[PDB]
Amino acid sequence: INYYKDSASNAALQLTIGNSTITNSVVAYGRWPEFIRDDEANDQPTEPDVATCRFYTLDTVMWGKESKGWWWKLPDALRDMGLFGQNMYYHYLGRSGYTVHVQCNASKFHQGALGVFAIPEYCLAGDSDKQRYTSYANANPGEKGGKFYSQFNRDTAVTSPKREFCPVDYLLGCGVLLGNAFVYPHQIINLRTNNSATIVLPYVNAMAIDSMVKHNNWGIAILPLSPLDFAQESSVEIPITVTIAPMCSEFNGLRNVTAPKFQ
Amino acid sequence: INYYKDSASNAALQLTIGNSTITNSVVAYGRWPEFIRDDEANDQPTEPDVATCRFYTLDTVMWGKESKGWWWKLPDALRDMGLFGQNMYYHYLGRSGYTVHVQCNASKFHQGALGVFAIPEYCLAGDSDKQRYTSYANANPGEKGGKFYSQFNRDTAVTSPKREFCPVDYLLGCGVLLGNAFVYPHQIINLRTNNSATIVLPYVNAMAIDSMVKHNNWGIAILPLSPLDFAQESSVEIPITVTIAPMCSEFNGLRNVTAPKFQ
Amino acid sequence: INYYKDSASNAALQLTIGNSTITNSVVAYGRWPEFIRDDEANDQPTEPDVATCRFYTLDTVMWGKESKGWWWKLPDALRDMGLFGQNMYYHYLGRSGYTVHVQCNASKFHQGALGVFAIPEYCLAGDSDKQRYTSYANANPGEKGGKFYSQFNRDTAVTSPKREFCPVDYLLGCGVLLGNAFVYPHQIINLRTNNSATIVLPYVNAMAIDSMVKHNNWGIAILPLSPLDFAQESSVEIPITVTIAPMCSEFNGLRNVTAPKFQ
Amino acid sequence: GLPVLNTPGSNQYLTSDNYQSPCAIPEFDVTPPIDIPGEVKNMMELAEIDTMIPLNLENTKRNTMDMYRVTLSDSADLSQPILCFSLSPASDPRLSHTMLGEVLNYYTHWAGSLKFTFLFCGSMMATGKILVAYAPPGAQPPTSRKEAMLGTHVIWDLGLQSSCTMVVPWISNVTYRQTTQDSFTEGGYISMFYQTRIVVPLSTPKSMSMLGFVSACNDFSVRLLRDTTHISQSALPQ
Amino acid sequence: GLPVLNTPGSNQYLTSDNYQSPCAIPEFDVTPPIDIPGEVKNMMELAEIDTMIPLNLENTKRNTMDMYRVTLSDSADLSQPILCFSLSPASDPRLSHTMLGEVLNYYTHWAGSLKFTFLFCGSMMATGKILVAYAPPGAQPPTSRKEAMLGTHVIWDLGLQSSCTMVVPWISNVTYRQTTQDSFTEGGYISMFYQTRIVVPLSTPKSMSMLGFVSACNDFSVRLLRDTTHISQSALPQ
Amino acid sequence: GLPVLNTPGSNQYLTSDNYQSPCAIPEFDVTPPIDIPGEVKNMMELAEIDTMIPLNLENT
Amino acid sequence: QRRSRSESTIESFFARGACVAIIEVDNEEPTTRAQKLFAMWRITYKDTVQLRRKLEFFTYSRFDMELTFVVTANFTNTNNGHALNQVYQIMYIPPGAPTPKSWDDYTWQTSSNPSIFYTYGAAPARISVPYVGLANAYSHFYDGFAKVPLKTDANDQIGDSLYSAMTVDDFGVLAIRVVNDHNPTKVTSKVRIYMKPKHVRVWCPRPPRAVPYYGPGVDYKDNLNPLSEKGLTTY
Amino acid sequence: QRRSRSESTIESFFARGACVAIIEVDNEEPTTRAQKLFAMWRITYKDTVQLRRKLEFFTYSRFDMELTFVVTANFTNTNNGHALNQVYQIMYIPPGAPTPKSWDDYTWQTSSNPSIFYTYGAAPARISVPYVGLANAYSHFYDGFAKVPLKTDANDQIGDSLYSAMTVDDFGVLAIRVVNDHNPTKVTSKVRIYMKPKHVRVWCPRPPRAVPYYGPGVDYKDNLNPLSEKGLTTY
Ligand SMILES: CCO/N=C/c1ccc(OCC[C@@H](C)CCN2CCN(c3ccncc3)C2=O)cc1
Ligand SMILES: CCO/N=C/c1ccc(OCC[C@@H](C)CCN2CCN(c3ccncc3)C2=O)cc1
Ligand SMILES: N[C@@H](CCC(=O)N[C@@H](CS)C(=O)NCC(=O)O)C(=O)O
Ligand SMILES: N[C@@H](CCC(=O)N[C@@H](CS)C(=O)NCC(=O)O)C(=O)O
């Protein structure tokens, strides 16, 4: 029998989106993106349908024998993509899901394997003795993204510290073994079987809607699980491309435009 | 389950009154004055109908640029008004509600604002280091009332202390910020919109009936929220008048007349 | 809920009697004398009907200006009255109620007031430093009774202590203010209105029946509430008479006669 | 066994607590009671019994029989009061030691009406008229018949009736009054005056005595039991 | 007797506990209550009452009547704001000491919409138009009418109406906001600007005063009772 | 667990108390009784038996 | 509603624990001279005055009783070491039962007499007692004697008895001792007894005492001027 | 669901134990000079400011009370030995009842006054009290006097009384003593009293205090500049 009143006291193929078309997919946590429901809110939202929910292509990168990996942050990577960025900077609160498509083509005589991982609340480690001293500009590279490293290079500057991340490939840049990174939503591109990967990411956060400028909801990490090789050539390089499509995006809190200082 | 027997142990327009007529109103706490009910009493009461429930006009005051405010106490202000005062002094117990009407007229080229506040159990601060040393005579000025001040002037007399109040305008004379005085029943007279104010005060006290001589039930405070001005003249003065009508008055405990010593 | 078995543990005109006739009455505690009931006893009782239930008249006393009061004890005062005393001394256990009649006559030009009080378990104070040292003979004066005093006269004898009571009029002889003596059954004789008093006393005791020799059940106290006066004469004296009638008397425990030593 | 949690107040002794305790003499044959006259159920029953008032507390008369008597005469000043006191049942010296006052001194709050009685003990040939007045608090205590008559007053004729009774009703701002002296719970004043005078014929006493009694009515109640100041102790028995 | 087992937390005193205790005055006749005007059931009822805002907290005007007045004139710079503050009901100095702020300082979390009122105390012959704007957080605080108009703004006509009301609705990422200063729970900004200007005729004052009031709406709630910082003590009474 | 409050008299030993206590020899096969002549139910039964009186208590 | 008389009842008037006895007991090395190793107290309520005065409002009474014991101990010196927690024994001796002559005699076996063993530092001890009056009600006042002198008596002392006394030994006594042996340092202790009547019935109300008590009886010696001065015509 | 106002109720707002009194009591050998053997505290909530400020939000109130007592003891020296566990007595003296003049006078018999006996080291003591107001509600603020001077008064002191005071002695006092006798070493102790209102009703809300309290009344002496500086057009 419970005595106290409070409960706490109780003892215990082609995909077309908007005006864009790309020619199996993985759905994160088995949850498709959806709009906010009437039983959860905090004014009239602004919900663009086709002016923002479309595929945007990022800058192509090059994969060689010495490449260690790449990473991007969302919605940071799309801050300068058409009207999506304008709505992001003109509103205090934003929400959206994503569709990520990774393209990399090779021949039958090439070999290699890429692992793509989608990580919620992807926090990276610094490059100095000081803790949590990374700057906003360095933590939001944009569409260019960042790269991984095979060793921890401590910053020796004392007058003008860099205040940058120092990810480590085999620690996933956060102090966890890479082998377990498959616990996150993931895809594998093996050159002998396939040449592309697709993932669908719903909106994940402790709040229904949150600011897009000061908080990044998703991180994308691409790492070479097996080194690239071709016949018996000494040097090999192939392009890797990334495309991202926002889905079911909502904005609220219209006011003057935000102008962050990126360097 | 409760074990102990005692409950305490349990765990937790023209208005005409009498022969007087005056030509929106505010009702304090949404309660109209009423007589005592049969389910609450302690002899035959005396309940004058028209000989005491009528409008009495107090002395007019002058409002200028340097005026800081005025205050009155009820039923003290009506101690010498017709038969109401006689009944007050001929009976041990009294009860009554009030209707207060404040009149102040100006032109369209004047500007200013008056705040009128009705305060139950309005206690004022002294003017000396000694605590609660104010005299009865000084605490009951009568129909003349008192005035506010902008600073605390400590009494330096040691032989013949004045024993008087020292109200401060921005502290409401009781140590509370004036901005919150609107929590009490209140009215605002703005010269550009209206020229009069009306309030209705029911009987409020911890007891159904109480003595009128040694206890004052209500206080009236008038303060200038905005300074008075007229065109570009250096000096401006206008009259302010106050009228009070008792309502539903009861008296009990007939005996010889009381003669307080006012100086 | 009670846990323990024991309850203690539970948490909390002419009046004719016999061959005598006397020509309003007061009944003590509103209880008329009655015989013992079958539901309370401890042999065959002896219950005289007319040989003992009749009026006996005591010795007359004199009331003057300096008189302070008189007192008697019952059944002590009737120890030598006809067959009642014989039955009292021939039996171990006795029980009885009483009717007391006080007579005092004066003229219309006299003035005064007498207070008569019937006291159960009337215990009086001693006249020495020693406590409870009063003798049996002094505590049972008989039909003569005793008198009150206006001051406490300590006995200075050290060789042959008197061992007598020293009642004080204003303390009722027991350390209690006389003004409250009206809590007991009482009568007032005011010479301007009446000339006689009557009281009826039922049997009162912690036991149904008790010995009459070693225990007195009632005490009678007569005190002058107002001094006696007549015209402008210096000395005034009038007689006061007392009559007592036993009622519903029972006796038990027949054996040889008791002969107490009274001096 | 059964899980339990001890709360504040455990292992304390409160003199006013009401709990069960074990019995040291189990299986005791209690003596049955009998019907004894004079059973009392409530203490207020004692306060309803009239008792004399020591009206005269002068230096040479207090603690003496004469303190219960008030003198009256045919040659007294008719413009001066006969007696005067205050309606303080438990704190006034003339009322504190009465049975009502003794009961009240064991309680902190009281409320209700009172009954006063006056008995005239003169000769049958004496005649006169008296005025007994009660004045609620707030004004000057009465000093003359003109002021007293404005209150609650009764006129008493000695010749026709030898006793008079006046009921002081309950009138107060607070629901209960304190039993101690306090100006915020003052009760009023009681006064007496001559109406015409005492008249006597020849060969009759010219001086007489009067007595007073007080009691509580059926609408009397008390609160907040407390110890009294009328009994003290200095040394424990050895 | 009954087997029992004592658990952790026994014989401790928690100031927020709710247990039963014995009564020291059993059988007390409580005075019945009466219907007194002004009964209050919830503290939020006090937060719904409008109270003045000390908008002007300058060095020579704070702690003085003039701190409740904002000056307006017909010769003022139309390109500069009239007043500006932040939507911090409990930490902003201009809002902390209001009744809403006083109530909030006793609680740790708050949520709900707000209502602001502005009263114009000029002459009847004065005319003008004003713009009152609220901007959610995230961007630079507005410094001009062009930036302010992009937010939630209301236009007020002095001549037709002497009072204006603007409702700031609830918009936040978190369900509740802290009552202390914190950039993660920032509320926004409030600004005012001239729309056209103050226009007056001849023989009329060219300067006037304006007053401000704030209150909470019916959708306002608080959490996590806590002590306030507005009252302190240094020495206990002797 | 269940809130409780300790009252006066806790942890005291009264020789006349009547409470339950644990058994130190659980599951004991008690020997059944038999009908023995002379059973006594009340002490007063002994007071009803006549006995001689030492009437003569002289020194010798 | 209307005012009630709930708190003026007899039960409420006596629903309070009143001290009736303070008793001293010491623990130290036994010696030839007099000591306070064990104490005996005669049961009564006339040692104190407050409860006595409250009870004397009536002539006859009938009630059960609740007794509470509070024990407080202390040292006397500092250079003789310390002591361990002590255990106190309280035994009720009715009339006719043997009385102890030492702190460790056979009488403490309490084969039939009830006893309480109290451990220092625990809650105050408590017990309840029923009405144990020989008659149908207790007699606060008794106007009589226990013996009557007779003419045939050889001497006057045969029939001599105290006035207003029923029995010499009534209700027995309470014997208090310290069970523990003596430590090298003396330890003193006081036991306070508090009494509360329960299920109270009373008969024959009487006026209350007005002068200081003097002895078990109604005798008065000093302070016979209770009332104070006051003017006849003074408010 | 939607946000609720459960914790903003009057009951929740006052459902906390607030300290209202710190009282000092000492145990040592009695001497001619002044000592702290027993202490008396006048009951009120104006000694502290937090509960006073919370209650002064309203003009009239009506509630029951819960009181809790926490006792902490300590030594003062080291060369006078030690002491055994002490017992504390707390007695409530209503107006009109006799007050003690010594730590061991008859007034401690508490025949009718309620009392608490507390053993050191046990759980903090606790009691509950009902509404004991003479009127229908407590009056936090009183604008009046207890006496009115009259023209016929002989002197001006007859009608002189303090402003905003109903009764001089209200609600009685609490007397605290140490029952134990004095050990050779002095022992000091502090009793902290915590009050919690229950079943609370309030009337006539008022603005809260803005300047430091000065006396039982509404007087103010110093620190009359509460607000701080801030720019008119500064966010
Ligand atoms: C193991 C120890 O526990 N035993 C305790 C105990 C306590 C009280 C017991 O009874 C003692 C007698 C009481 C019922 C009170 C006797 N009263 C009532 C009447 N009375 C009295 C005294 C003097 N004059 C008249 C009446 C008393 O003193 C018996 C045993
Ligand atoms: C054995 C000891 O236990 N007795 C404890 C006890 C505790 C409190 C008791 O009541 C004291 C009065 C309280 C109900 C609070 C009085 N209040 C309420 C109104 N008030 C106050 C004070 C100053 N100005 C206005 C109102 C107060 O101080 C009575 C007995
Ligand atoms: N430090 C001061 C006493 C401090 C004190 O009494 N503080 C009060 C308020 S100023 C308090 O609330 N004390 C809480 C406590 O320490 O129990 C001294 O002993 O001189
Ligand atoms: N101070 C005295 C003893 C005081 C005493 O025993 N007082 C009695 C009544 S006169 C009492 O009631 N004491 C209460 C107590 O201190 O426990 C002494 O030791 O010489």
Author numbering:
A (entry chain B), B (entry chain B), C (entry chain B): 30 to 41, 83 to 93, 99 to 117, 120 to 340
D (entry chain C), E (entry chain C): 1 to 238
F (entry chain C): 1 to 60
G (entry chain A), H (entry chain A): 66 to 300
Paper text:
The Enterovirus (EV) genus of the Picornaviridae family contains notable viral pathogens that cause various animal and human diseases and are regarded as potential zoonotic threats. These small non-enveloped RNA viruses contain 60 copies each of the viral proteins VP1-4 arranged to form an icosahedral protein capsid. VP1-3 each comprise a β-barrel with extended surface loops and C-termini that form the outer capsid surface. The N-termini of VP1-3, as well as the whole of VP4 (N-terminal to VP2 in the VP0 precursor), form a network on the inner surface. Glutathione (GSH), an important cellular reducing agent, is a crucial co-factor for the morphogenesis of enteroviruses, including PV.
Since PV3-SC8 has previously been shown to bind pocket factors such as GPP3 in the VP1 hydrophobic pocket, we investigated in situ if GSH binding interferes with this stabilisation mechanism by incubating a molar excess of GPP3 (VLP:compound molar ratio of 1:300) followed by GSH at 10 mM to form a ternary complex (PV3-SC8GPP3+GSH) with the PV3-SC8 VLP expressed in yeast. The overall structure of the GSH-bound PV3-SC8 VLP is essentially identical to the unbound native antigenic form of PV3-SC8 VLP expressed previously in the plant, mammalian and yeast cells, with root-mean-square deviation (RMSD) in Cα atoms of 0.68, 1.39 and 0.77 Å, respectively. As expected GPP3 was observed bound within the hydrophobic pocket of VP1, in an essentially identical conformation to that previously observed for this compound bound to plant expressed PV3-SC818. The GSH molecule observed bound in the VP1–VP3 surface pocket of the PV3-SC8 VLP is anchored in place by hydrogen bonds, salt-bridges and hydrophobic interactions. The carboxyl group of the GSH glycine moiety forms hydrogen bonds with two critical arginine residues; Arg257 and Arg242, contributed from neighbouring VP1 subunits of two capsid protomers. Additional hydrogen bonds are formed between Asp169 and Gln174 of VP1 with the amide and carbonyl oxygen groups of the cysteine moiety of GSH, respectively.
